[PDB]
Design a protein around this ligand. Structure first.
Ligand SMILES: CNC(=O)c1ccc2c(c1)ncn2-c1ccc(CNC(=O)c2cc(Cc3ccccc3)n(C)n2)cc1
Length: 274
């Protein structure tokens, strides 16, 4: 239940693509993901600040939030060890040859809502909610993550050491945050990202494929351009299109909270989707 101090000797591994990440087989505990944050020539000393922060992160415990299983804190090697989510990210599931049924998509949306309401209920503002931070297990249940690791203050800090040998977010970023280095993220910013995730779940693709240039898209979105609702070929219930439109509202105060989305979406899910 708690964070375990693991040793590098307890594993064997393999590389992978992510915000490096390598799957690892633990000698006695089985398959895990190891994210190595620092591998260096400098024995570092503030091991406790790194360990306490992982214990503090480990306090976010919910069925829809990725669990940290352990940490490797040793001479020149610092790694986060996490549970493996076997299907990868939500975009990989959506672009797969087999199509996800509407009932399973409905459940995925509800589970994203539950995860986000839980995080906001803990005073945690995600700032990069997007399909790559939504992980999927073999049963198609989701768990929200933060692969950039911005939420872990010291682990991010430790990565930026200079004796250490070691974007795309724009589509999901709320327009107040676009072209601004100082915009502070709010719960309503995450609600905006959820609306674009909602569109992508039904379009099975990334938004704005016809955008020629990044400054064009940034200026377009700020003037009120949104993902094309007509470019959803599959059937999206009118209730979800209405919700998507309310959540990407230009005015942040018009956007609902995740608890208010849950109250509306769950009865609809149960009555209309499964
Ligand atoms: C094809 N590729 C994959 O198959 C694939 C890729 C990455 C995977 C994975 C499978 N299976 C687990 N990963 C994984 C999970 C987490 C991390 C890094 N860790 C976190 O993101 C994290 C976030 C939190 C709590 C939190 C959540 C949301 C907002 C703020 C804070 N905690 C405890 N850890 C790295 C890899």
């Amino acid at each position: 239940l708690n964070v375990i101090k693991m040793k590098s000797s307890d594993f064997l591994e393999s590389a992978e693509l992510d915000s490096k990440v390598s799957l690892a087989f633990h000698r006695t505990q089985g398959l895990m993901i190891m994210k190595t944050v620092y591998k260096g020539p400098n024995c570092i000393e503030h091991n406790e600040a790194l360990l306490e922060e992982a214990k503090m992160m480990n306090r976010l415990r919910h069925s829809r939030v990725v669990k940290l299983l352990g940490v490797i804190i040793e001479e020149g090697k610092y790694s986060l060890v996490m549970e493996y989510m076997e299907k990868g990210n939500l975009m990989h599931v959506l672009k797969a040859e087999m199509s996800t049924p509407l009932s399973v998509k409905g459940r995925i949306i509800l589970e994203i809502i539950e995860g986000m309401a839980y995080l906001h209920g803990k005073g945690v503002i995600h700032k990069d909610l997007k399909p790559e931070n939504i992980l999927v297990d073999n049963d198609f249940h989701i768990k929200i993550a933060d692969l950039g690791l911005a939420s872990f203050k010291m682990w991010s800090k430790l990565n930026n050491e200079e004796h250490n040998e070691l974007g795309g977010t724009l589509y999901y970023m709320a327009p107040e945050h676009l072209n601004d280095v100082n915009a502070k993220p709010t719960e309503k910013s995450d609600v905006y990202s959820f609306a674009v995730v909602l569109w992508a779940i039904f379009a099975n693709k990334e938004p704005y494929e016809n955008a020629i240039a990044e400054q064009q898209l940034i200026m377009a979105i700020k003037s009120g351009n949104r993902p094309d609702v007509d470019d959803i070929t599959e059937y999206c219930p009118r209730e979800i299109i209405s919700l998507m439109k309310l959540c990407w509202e230009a005015n942040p105060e018009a956007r609902p909270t995740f608890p208010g989305i849950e109250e509306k979406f769950r009865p609809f899910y149960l009555s209309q989707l499964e």
